[PDB]
Amino acid sequence: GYSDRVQQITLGNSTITTQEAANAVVCYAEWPEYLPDVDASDVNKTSKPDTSVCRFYTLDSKTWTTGSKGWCWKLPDALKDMGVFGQNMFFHSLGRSGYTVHVQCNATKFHSGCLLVVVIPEHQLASHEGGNVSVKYTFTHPGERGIDLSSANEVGGPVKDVLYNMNGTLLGNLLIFPHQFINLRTNNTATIVIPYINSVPIDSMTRHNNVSLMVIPIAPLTVPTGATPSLPITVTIAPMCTEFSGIRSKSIVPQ
Amino acid sequence: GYSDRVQQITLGNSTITTQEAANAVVCYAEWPEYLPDVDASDVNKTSKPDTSVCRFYTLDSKTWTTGSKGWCWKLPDALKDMGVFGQNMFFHSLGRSGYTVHVQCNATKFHSGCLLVVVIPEHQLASHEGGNVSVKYTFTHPGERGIDLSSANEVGGPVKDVLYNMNGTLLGNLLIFPHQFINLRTNNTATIVIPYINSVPIDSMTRHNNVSLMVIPIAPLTVPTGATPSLPITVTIAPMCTEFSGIRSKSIVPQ
Amino acid sequence: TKDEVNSYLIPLNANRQNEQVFGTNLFIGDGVFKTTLLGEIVQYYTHWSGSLRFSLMYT
Amino acid sequence: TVASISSGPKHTQKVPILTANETGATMPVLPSDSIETRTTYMHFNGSETDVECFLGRAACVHVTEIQNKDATGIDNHREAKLFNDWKINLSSLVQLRKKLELFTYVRFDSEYTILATASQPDSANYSSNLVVQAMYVPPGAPNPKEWDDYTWQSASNPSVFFKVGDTSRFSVPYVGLASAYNCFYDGYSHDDAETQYGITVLAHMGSMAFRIVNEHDEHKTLVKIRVYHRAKHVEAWIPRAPRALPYTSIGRTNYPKNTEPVIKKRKGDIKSY
Amino acid sequence: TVASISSGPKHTQKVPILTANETGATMPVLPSDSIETRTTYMHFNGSETDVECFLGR
Amino acid sequence: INYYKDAASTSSAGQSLSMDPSKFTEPVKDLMLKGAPALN
Amino acid sequence: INYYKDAASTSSAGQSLSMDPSKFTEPVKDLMLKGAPALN
Amino acid sequence: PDTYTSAGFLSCWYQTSLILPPETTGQVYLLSFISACPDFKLRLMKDTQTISQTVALTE
Numbered sequence A, B: 001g002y003s004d005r006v007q008q009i010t011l012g013n014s015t016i017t018t019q020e021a022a023n024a025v026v027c028y029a030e031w032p033e034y035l036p037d038v039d040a041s042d043v044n045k046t047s048k049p050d051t052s053v054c055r056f057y058t059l060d061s062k063t064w065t066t067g068s069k070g071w072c073w074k075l076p077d078a079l080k081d082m083g084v085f086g087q088n089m090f091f092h093s094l095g096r097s098g099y100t101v102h103v104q105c106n107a108t109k110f111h112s113g114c115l116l117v118v119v120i121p122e123h124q125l126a127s128h129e130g131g132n133v134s135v136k137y138t139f140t141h142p143g144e145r146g147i148d149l150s151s152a153n154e155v156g157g158p159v160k161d162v163l164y165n166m167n168g169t170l171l172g173n174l175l176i177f178p179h180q181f182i183n184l185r186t187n188n189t190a191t192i193v194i195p196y197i198n199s200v201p202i203d204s205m206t207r208h209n210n211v212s213l214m215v216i217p218i219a220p221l222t223v224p225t226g227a228t229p230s231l232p233i234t235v236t237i238a239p240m241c242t243e244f245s246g247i248r249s250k251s252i253v254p255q
Numbered sequence C: 001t002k003d004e005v006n007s008y009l010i011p012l013n014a015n016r017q018n019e020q021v022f023g024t025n026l027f028i029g030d031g032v033f034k035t036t037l038l039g040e041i042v043q044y045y046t047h048w049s050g051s052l053r054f055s056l057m058y059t
Numbered sequence D: 001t002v003a004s005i006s007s008g009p010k011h012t013q014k015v016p017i018l019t020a021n022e023t024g025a026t027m028p029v030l031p032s033d034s035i036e037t038r039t040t041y042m043h044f045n046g047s048e049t050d051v052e053c054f055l056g057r058a059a060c061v062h063v064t065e066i067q068n069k070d071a072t073g074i075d076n077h078r079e080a081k082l083f084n085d086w087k088i089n090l091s092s093l094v095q096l097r098k099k100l101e102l103f104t105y106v107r108f109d110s111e112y113t114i115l116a117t118a119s120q121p122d123s124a125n126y127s128s129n130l131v132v133q134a135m136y137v138p139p140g141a142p143n144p145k146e147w148d149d150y151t152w153q154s155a156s157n158p159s160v161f162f163k164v165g166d167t168s169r170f171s172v173p174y175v176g177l178a179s180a181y182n183c184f185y186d187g188y189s190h191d192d193a194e195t196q197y198g199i200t201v202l203a204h205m206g207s208m209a210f211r212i213v214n215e216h217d218e219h220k221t222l223v224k225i226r227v228y229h230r231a232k233h234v235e236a237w238i239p240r241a242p243r244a245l246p247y248t249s250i251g252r253t254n255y256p257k258n259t260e261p262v263i264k265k266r267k268g269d270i271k272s273y
Numbered sequence E: 001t002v003a004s005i006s007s008g009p010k011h012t013q014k015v016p017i018l019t020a021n022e023t024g025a026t027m028p029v030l031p032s033d034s035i036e037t038r039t040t041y042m043h044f045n046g047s048e049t050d051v052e053c054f055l056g057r
Numbered sequence F, G: 001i002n003y004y005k006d007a008a009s010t011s012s013a014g015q016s017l018s019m020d021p022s023k024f025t026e027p028v029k030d031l032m033l034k035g036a037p038a039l040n
Numbered sequence H: 001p002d003t004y005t006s007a008g009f010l011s012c013w014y015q016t017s018l019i020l021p022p023e024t025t026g027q028v029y030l031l032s033f034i035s036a037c038p039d040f041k042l043r044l045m046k047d048t049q050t051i052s053q054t055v056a057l058t059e
């Protein structure tokens, strides 16, 4: 009586149940694991807070309306302030982590709409100015708020044009990245497990984000007659196999 | 060529060397160890940050002068703000820890003076008011500053009379507690290893301090002629075998 | 202001408490490090990796 | 190898063509799951689509130019193209660039070919024979200042001398600092509020510098350098969506404003053929 | 080859970091004598620092 | 025959002949069998 | 393959792979053990 | 020196304080050394900014 459909994920002191899942994606078919010695470089023993950092943090909720263009969060940024995960983050020189991402959106059998939930490794954004204008730090570190693709261009911020993925590629091809759809008629959640993907064994958690999670409405939300025209979307994310190394004074970052 | 005299303690990412030690005391002849299952009650898996919390924090320095009466720090309070030790502390419901305490005071072969360095398990202080006046919270949670026994009585604070240990017992008998002397002529540091001592397996780190460390001048400081009449005393302390459990929202404590 | 035997000497003051003796960044190819044998060889190569040993002898 | 097996009529309870794309999978459906097929063999291996093959041919990565002329009274050789350099990079010319950016991290050895041809746009009695000396100047090396500085001694820095009209060829191991080169980098060099964003911070591999060794003849001679790059021993990770809009800068993802629709509009209906 | 071995807390009478430089030696002290380390391998031979290589171009 | 000492100097590599699209086409956590229902 | 008769005409030598810093880092007459006191 | 690639800082402070014996006075100095651990790797040889010249030397 197991269905692909019902699932439970327990991680730390927190549990999620979905009764309307559509399997789960594990990026590149690899599950998060700690850093092996053969791959290690820094000689420091690392710190593995385990259950105090590897639990589920639910970010603040978004509201899908008929005019929504899509939202974008960066990792580990989105979690920069969650509990002890965040403290560890500002206090060590280097850290590394994988995540379980669970995006939630329920409706009824009269609604229609379909969101794309995708994880993009190394999502370098484009400046809407063109040329070689850079995208300032603050703009690519929105924190739990994430970036709202239907917000206005700002100065020093990225471009927010959806048919171009914020980088000069077409929305249609985002499907080459680990992703899952939430089609109100099928699905009510999306779950993706992200292994740590980098060109170095461990890195800085503040100067470099290693994935952007993106939720994009593709088939517009259509509510039943005289229904309220909107649904909330909630994102809950859990660091998994986290390791921190090179402890010290506590980083100070712009803004 | 090993002497009782020279020592090195490396704990985490921090190391201490003393070239003029007088052995080291291990309270009640027991070395800090984690909490065994047979002794466990709370069902929660605990978090053991290891090297990020088990390193040496050096508190701010004191100044021994001919008029000094002695100083008193409480644990884990004194460390409530040190790095990730402190964060963990405010963020979990329960925690447990042992410590290595290293008290430092060097002079020259012309100085004289002798400090008592003692650890008192469950040091319940007395109100200087008498009767059944209580000692308010803030007063018994001085933080890294500790309590200065030569400061004035304050209201809601403890009594600071040294011949009575702040509790109705005589200074002379403090020697029944694990302790070590720093006699300028012999010694320049004192080191005590404290195992976790409580009547419960794990407790709250904020509502209850489980040891007071006390440094008390007993033979007054006497400097050579026309020397400056004072010496600094420094206290460095390292949590060891720390475990935190029952993570959540982050305690808010008076003042 | 001119090279002198004295820039090898880090001075120490009696009776100061809490204060700072010296500071430097660790760009081994520049600044204090640059004229040392280590600094001087590192400069023949583009990349370095490894641990450094910094010791202080008291006089 | 069979490309298709033989398959006949089906009337089952087992439907391989109905799936749920919401899952993120592309189910491996074949012609034989939905029509009746006959056996056929592949006759093919997919040899020429190997990434080593795809990135393994020489591509032009840079065209520069230097001239041989009397430097007498020139206050700025660099500025007179008495010698010139190149801030090595592989993203400046954009044919090879789109190919590499199909991947996120890439690791390979490089084989460089350098073709140099001369031009004599104004009245010369003859064509002189010049020797070029392109030399690699890595980060933290005395950058050269005149066309005949001590720098050109290049006692520790690899340099090649070849003749204009000829070609020079040599191969440099993978010089990246990490395990792979980042084709993309969503980071900064540090957490400052105004520091550049991209790979440009990352992929500062030092520059290459060219000059003519010959002193000057009576006429002037323009020498134009073309650098070709071939990846050998290629390793590529994490495929990405291909580049759709035009490029504007080395190292940023930025596209031009008021660009044109990249999807061709139908001449007719959705229903049109 | 290991570049660093794993090493944990220390509370000894054996202090490898105190020396006497007046002797003229450079004592071979390592990260693992004064912090807690994890194993890591060298992955490197020192090929390009051989004097034949240094003077050979 | 390599005429040169260093590995970078050798010719192009030879075909992976590796080929396994499943990390890209089927990264699902619970295995899907073609023919069985997608969602049970 | 050497094509030439004289030894000077051969290519570069091959890595010492000798490496022993102790003549430079520890030329002391009585052996010093790390961890034991420097001066006894 | 490069940012992305930067290595940190090194500082030194009084832990307690220097104390001179009687009949003694003034500043004392520390000598400081640097050498590389056996850990160390250097690669990709290049030319040093530490030496240059304007005309060839002669005897």
Ligand SMILES: Cc1cc(CCCCCOc2ccc(C3=NCCO3)cc2)on1
Pocket: D088, D089, D090, D110, D112, D134, D135, D136, D158, D159, D160, D172, D175, D181, D203, D205, D208
């Ligand atoms: C991606 C990507 C591609 C690159 C370029 C890397 C190549 C390494 C450095 O390139 C050279 C170029 C020229 C020479 C040279 N030596 C003597 C003459 O030319 C040496 C290394 O950086 N990132």
